[PDB]
Amino acid sequence: PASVPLRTEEEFKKFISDKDASIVGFFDDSFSEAHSEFLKAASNLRDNYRFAHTNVESLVNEYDDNGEGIILFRPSHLTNKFEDKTVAYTEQKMTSGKIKKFIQENIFGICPHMTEDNKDLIQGKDLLIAYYDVDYEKNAKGSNYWRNRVMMVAKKFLDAGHKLNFAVASRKTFSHELSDFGLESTAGEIPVVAIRTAKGEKFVMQEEFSRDGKALERFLQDYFDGNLKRYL
């Protein structure tokens, strides 16, 4: 069961309401070539993402116009003004390789919440993390407050040419990582920020994170300009 069959709208809504993203296939034909390739991708990536599919007419018709589509659904608690909750697979042809590329390029969006479960999928490319009291069980409000400030800045640099990934992470859960950056773990609300490049260079924001996001903005500008001393 690398992909969960969803036989009802209750089941589909239940599936997509998770704290992790959903990759849902919509096929009126359960034996199509494309349904086959869907299941191959689900099988290859079964531990990395949550796959489901459906042939429920009302659902396939809602999400696709040709009886053959895939929608990524981002976590509803992470919805934000900078991207949408859904991303439809846009290619005409469906292969497992192409479904794999699609999910990697799209599932996380601009600034995922990095967790113990997804951390190895977020890490590895040049990456800025903002560490603070991320916790959507007890602190949804403060979680969003800071993440929206980080995203508003990220999106300005992304919209310009710049290539860098962004994530928010619990300063607590990832306390061991902080020492790599000369940072300490606190219960504090105000984020600390460090970049690690894929090649291993580390850059640590020095100024306190201002609510107006301009400290983060100055840190990123300096990073891209190459005016930062690397940390160690």
| Helix (H) or strand (E) run with residue 179 in it | none
CA 41 to chain centre: 19
DSSP-based helix, strand, coil % in the chain, nearest 5: 35, 20, 45
Helix (H, G, I), strand (E, B) or coil at 68: strand
**189 within domain boundaries:** yes
Residues 54 and 103 in one domain: yes
Helix (H, G, I), strand (E, B) or coil at 97: helix
For residue 110, what are the contacts with CB-CB under 8 A and spacing of at least 6? 82, 83, 151, 154, 155, 158, 166
Q: Which two tokens stand for residue 191?
A: 């984020």
Residue found by looking up tokens 């959507």 in the block: 136
Residues 96 and 147 in one domain: no
Residues 129 and 70 in one domain: no
CA 123 to chain centre: 11
The closest of 72, 173, 24 to 113, measured between CA atoms, is: 173
Task: Give the C-alpha separation, 91 to 69, whole Å.
Answer: 9
CATH of the domain at 57: 3.40.30.10
Crossing angle of helices 33-44 and 96-106, rounded to 10°: 60
Residues comprising the chain, all counted: 232
Residues 148 and 215 in one domain: yes
Which of 113, 132, 162 is at the close of a domain?
Answer: 113
Residues 108 and 10 in one domain: yes
Q: What approach was used to elucidate this structure? A: X-ray
Helix (H, G, I), strand (E, B) or coil at 106: helix
Written as one string, the DSSP assignment of 125-167 is: SSEEEEEE---TTT-HHHHHHHHHHHHHHHHHHHHTT---EEE
Which of 68, 87, 113 is at the close of a domain?
Answer: 113
Task: Give the C-alpha separation, 10 to 31, whole Å.
Answer: 24
Q: What sections of the chain are H helices per DSSP?
A: 9-16, 33-44, 57-63, 96-106, 119-122, 140-159, 175-178, 214-225
Count the domains in the chain. 2
Residues 64 and 153 in one domain: no
Chain breaks after residues in the chain, where C lies over 2.5 Å from next N = none
Residues 24 and 101 in one domain: yes
**219 within domain boundaries:** yes
Task: Give the C-alpha separation, 46 to 10, whole Å.
Answer: 23
Q: Which phi and psi angles does 82 have, rounded to 5°?
A: -100, -10
Crossing angle of helices 140-159 and 214-225, rounded to 10°: 40
Residues 32 and 86 in one domain: yes
Amino acid of residue 55 = N
Which strands sit side by side in the sheet containing 86-88, from one edge to the other?
Answer: 3-5, 50-54, 22-27, 68-73, 86-88
First to last CA, the chain: 46
Residues 119 and 104 in one domain: no
Please say whether the beta carbons of 192 and 132 come within 8 A. yes
Q: In terms of residue numbers, what domain contains 91?
A: 1-113
Residues 89 and 192 in one domain: no
Q: Which two tokens stand for residue 169?
A: 């992470």
Other CB atoms within 10 Å distance of the CB of residue 71: 18
Task: Give the C-alpha separation, 99 to 91, whole Å.
Answer: 9
Task: Give the C-alpha separation, 167 to 161, whole Å.
Answer: 19
Task: Give the C-alpha separation, 53 to 70, whole Å.
Answer: 8
Q: Which two tokens stand for residue 173?
A: 């859960």
For residue 28, what are the contacts with CB-CB under 8 A and spacing of at least 6? 55, 57, 60, 67, 68
Residues 4 and 105 in one domain: yes
Phi-psi region of 127 (alpha: psi -120 to 50; beta: other; left: phi over 0): beta
Q: Which two tokens stand for residue 75?
A: 């976590």
Please say whether the beta carbons of 54 and 6 come within 8 A. yes
Helix (H, G, I), strand (E, B) or coil at 101: helix
Resolution (A): 2.0
**232 within domain boundaries:** no
CA 101 to chain centre: 14
Which of 91, 113, 135 is at the close of a domain?
Answer: 113
The closest of 74, 79, 120, 111 to 193, measured between CA atoms, is: 111
Residues 26 and 83 in one domain: yes
**231 within domain boundaries:** no
